[PDB]
């Protein structure tokens, strides 16, 4: 993990995420959407649990991205929760929660759930 | 459970659900939205796991409601997954998934997640 996590990751839609896993559990980087324009780039911050292993378990981690930068303010934030698996074909399997700010009446429609798998290729 | 599940349940918004838990795990009934008009009523079907207990565990259950009746077709369905706890103040605690039919491009926004607690009062 750590060194293994550091780098560029891609999901099945083209989104790219670049992260640095620091010695003490920190995850910092940026997430870029499709198109790949100068700024479809948002800041991401998270944590990972290193021990992590004598039985091949994955490394648990999570990060958040608030969808606001100098070109867009989508009034929402997404958190990804999952684990990193290293090896020939390392990947990060996650489940995500995307919450949008709503009025109290619309709170029922505030959170979408999905999943993403990131690879180094 | 079973007898205990059979009856009328209300959640914190006013929605009402009426169910019959059958001998062999079946759950059948109707769900009614707020307003409580003749037909904000939709059919619900589900299952419950009876054993269910020498340690006070809840009874696991789940049901589905497709949001189509003779007055509305919301092109969506919701599934509730949770457990029934009986007693003085029996309740059903659930987490739900509401999926709307979308085109393949919009599939990311197809499922909302939330939770509901139902009581007999």
């Amino acid at each position: 993990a750590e060194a293994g996590i550091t780098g560029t990751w891609y999901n099945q839609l083209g989104s790219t995420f670049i992260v640095t896993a620091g010695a003490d559990g920190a995850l910092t980087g940026t997430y870029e959407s499709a198109v790949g324009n100068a700024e479809s780039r948002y800041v991401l911050t998270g944590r990972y649990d290193s021990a992590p292993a004598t039985d091949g378990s994955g490394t648990a981690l999570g990060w958040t991205v608030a969808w606001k930068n100098n070109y867009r303010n989508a009034h929402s934030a997404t958190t990804w929760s999952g684990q990193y698996v290293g090896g020939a074909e390392a990947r990060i399997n996650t489940q995500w929660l995307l919450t949008s700010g709503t009025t109290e009446a619309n709170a029922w429609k505030s959170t979408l759930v999905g999943h993403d798998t990131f690879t180094k290729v | 459970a079973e007898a205990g599940i059979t009856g009328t349940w209300y959640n914190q918004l006013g929605s009402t659900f009426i169910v019959t838990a059958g001998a062999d795990g079946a759950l059948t009934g109707t769900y009614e939205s707020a307003v409580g008009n003749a037909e904000s009523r939709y059919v619900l079907t589900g299952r419950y796991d009876s054993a269910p207990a020498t340690d006070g565990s809840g009874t696991a259950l789940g049901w589905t409601v497709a949001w189509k009746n003779n007055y509305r077709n919301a092109h969506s369905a919701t599934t509730w997954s949770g457990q029934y706890v009986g007693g003085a103040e029996a309740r059903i605690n659930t987490q739900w998934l509401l999926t709307s039919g979308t085109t393949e491009a919009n599939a990311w926004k197809s499922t909302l997640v939330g939770h509901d607690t139902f009581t007999k009062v």
Partner: peptide
């Protein structure tokens, strides 16, 4: 369309 996607 949301930034997470496009």
């Amino acid at each position: 369309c949301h930034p997470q996607f496009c």
